[PDB]
Design a protein around this ligand. Structure first.
Ligand SMILES: O=[N+]([O-])c1ccc2[nH]nnc2c1
Length: 249
């Protein structure tokens, strides 16, 4: 991983030590970026709903993850399931159970720093993973992206500034998450997010993530070329808000 400080250094150290999940996958791979483009062609707003029991940007939410994921199967283009243990209060078992219960694409959200965690995502049933530019060197990013694609996954490459975007293009990202929250300070900068979105080539599948809370914002971002919208805490609180994000109120 890159030289890191503070909580990022801590979470990367923890992830390096994460024991692997050693069972065979029992689920097809279903492409999250292809389904996003299908929604686009169908003029259906594409929301990637996240399940996260906690995050550094929100309070813990104790809801049944299965009931949540079955509800979202009706509406969302894909689910993102936060599996990191210390800061997201996640578990591989929650991912495994959700993947066993739903037939929409699933992204495993965690801090992926070694190949065995991509083996884990595949074996647990996730269709794809995020890879985070801020924590991985270019060589690790390239290696892990190639590794994930050898399983038939197309990872979301997470960026939050111009440096990250330059590295995403350099490693041949096809599917970019433009995160409006800086991982290190937790600050949201939407002006920067919109600038980055305007700099991405039109053939890359773009997900705007973090701080999206209104149908109007989604409509604005769609007009700038964004393909899909990742939304976590507002849906962890009120899953039915997803109906207004897709259909208006
Ligand atoms: O909780 N999540 O599943 C999840 C998904 C994507 C994200 N991007 N930035 N933070 C994120 C958290």
């Amino acid at each position: 991983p890159r030289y890191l400080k503070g909580w990022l250094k801590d979470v990367v150290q923890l992830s390096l030590r994460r024991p692997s999940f050693r069972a065979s996958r029992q689920r097809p791979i279903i492409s999250l970026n292809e389904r996003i483009l299908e929604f686009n062609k169908r003029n259906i707003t594409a929301i990637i709903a996240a399940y996260k029991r906690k995050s550094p940007s929100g309070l813990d939410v104790e809801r049944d993850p299965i009931e949540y994921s079955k509800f979202m199967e009706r509406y969302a283009v894909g689910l993102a399931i936060a599996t990191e243990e210390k800061y997201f209060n996640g578990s591989y078992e929650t991912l495994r159970k959700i993947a066993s219960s739903v037939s929409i694409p699933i992204l495993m959200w965690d801090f992926i720093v070694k190949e065995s965690q991509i083996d884990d995502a595949y074996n647990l049933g996730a269709d794809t993973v995020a890879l985070i530019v801020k924590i991985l060197t270019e060589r690790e990013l390239e290696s892990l992206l190639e590794y994930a694609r050898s399983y038939g996954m197309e990872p979301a490459i997470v960026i939050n500034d111009e440096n990250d975007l330059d590295i995403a293009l350099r490693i041949g990202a096809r599917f970019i998450e433009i995160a409006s929250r800086d991982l290190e300070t937790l600050e949201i900068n939407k002006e920067n997010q919109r600038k980055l979105i305007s700099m991405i080539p039109s053939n890359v599948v773009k997900v705007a993530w973090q701080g999206i809370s209104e149908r109007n914002e989604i409509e604005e971002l769609r007009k700038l070329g964004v393909n899909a919208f990742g939304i976590g805490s507002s849906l962890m609180r009120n899953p039915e808000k997803i109906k207004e994000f897709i259909l208006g109120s």
